[PDB]
């Protein structure tokens, strides 16, 4: 088993912390949802290859431009997150997060991940966003942003129901293993 490093980036409301918690426990917390994530080393077997994938969160580092890049050394794969219920989190991807990740992690694959996909057809979400002349992020807008930023791929998931969560981390492992 080779050791690989994954770091998740994105706005504070993108759901990166919850995604790491649900994947690491293979469960959406039934009693208490933790505020923070420390680290984890997941044992993953993808396409017959065994990998120990270390997982890191950047939550709490968004306002600290000299502390935040300390999370990047030797990263093998980046998960760049946005929330499907927040078109503002998608707008911050191309010229805030993308230039930063390309600078500190040159040539590292980026997977653009649309989190909270369960809220795309949520009536409360659609009513709230319509007050700001907005709507939940469409799959094609996600794919186009991923294409634009030179992402390795585009994926969607829901930490709430677990749908798509395993597939995201299995694909991140595949990306980390590429030349």
């Amino acid at each position: 088993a080779i050791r690989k490093k994954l770091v998740i980036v994105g706005d504070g409301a993108c759901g990166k912390t919850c995604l790491l918690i649900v994947f690491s426990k293979d469960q959406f917390p039934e009693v208490y949802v933790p505020t923070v994530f420390e680290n984890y080393v997941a044992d993953i077997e993808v396409d017959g290859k065994q990998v120990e994938l270390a997982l890191w969160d950047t939550a709490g580092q968004e306002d600290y431009d000299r502390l935040r890049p300390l999370s990047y050394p030797d990263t093998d794969v980046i998960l760049m997150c946005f929330s499907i219920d927040s078109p503002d989190s998608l707008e911050n991807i191309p010229e805030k997060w993308t230039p930063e990740v390309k600078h500190f992690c040159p040539n590292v694959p980026i997977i653009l991940v649309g989190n909270k996909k369960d809220l795309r057809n949520d009536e409360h979400t659609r009513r709230e966003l319509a007050k700001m002349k907005q709507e939940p992020v469409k799959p094609e807008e996600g794919r186009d942003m991923a294409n634009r930023i030179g992402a390795f791929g585009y994926m969607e998931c829901s930490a709430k129901t677990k749908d798509g969560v395993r597939e995201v981390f299995e694909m991140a492992t595949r990306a980390a293993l590429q030349a």
């Binding site: 917390p29 009693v31 208490y32 933790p34 505020t35 923070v36 420390e38 680290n39 984890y40 080393v41 270390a54 890191w56 969160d57 939550a59 709490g60 580092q61 306002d63 600290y64 431009d65 000299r66 502390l67 300390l70 999370s71 050394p73 030797d74």
Partner: protein, 245 residues
Amino acid sequence: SMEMDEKDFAADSWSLAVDSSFLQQHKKEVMKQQDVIYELIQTELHHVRTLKIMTRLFRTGMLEELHLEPGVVQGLFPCVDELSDIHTRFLSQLLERRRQALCPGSTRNFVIHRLGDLLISQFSGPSAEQMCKTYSEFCSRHSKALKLYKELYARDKRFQQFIRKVTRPAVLKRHGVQECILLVTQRITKYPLLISRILQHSHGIEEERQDLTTALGLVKELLSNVDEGIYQLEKGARLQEIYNR
């Protein structure tokens, strides 16, 4: 960590740690507040444990088994004794607040109503000056420690054997040298998230809401000061590269 504290913080939450008959005696909002305070103390216990792995397992093991050049162990683990003194003292205060709150006849049933004052004390005066000085130094030596570690692991056989030996047990899975360094660096930016969520469930007593509001402000001031005082040190960097920053 010592067994008594590990057992006190074994459950996933305060609501799962206390007896169900004691849990039933509290309102929903108090349970939500206590679950977040329990996460703050449990993650502090784990952070102090990360610092003990660095000082006792790694640093002391290298000094007593390996023949590294002078100034090499200090370069790998900058400010570890100062960091361990700051956080062990803060952990002691948190665990004493929990202990004083225990019901007579119980070693698990408690409610902490007055955390704000403890957090104001930790994040103000000489203790905040020491945290700011220590993290500004540690975080500025982060890149240098990682690079020194990689050089030694790839060129020194006895160093590689030592590392593979002490990190082999399953309980060290998340705690290799570079992982401990990043866990420590990321610790300070976890405090605002935890303090803000505790504040969200502490509106019942206005003095407590005000104290946590002051503490959140102090932690953010500390973080801004540390972030502004960081400049990555680089072995062999020339003065010209530095003054042309």
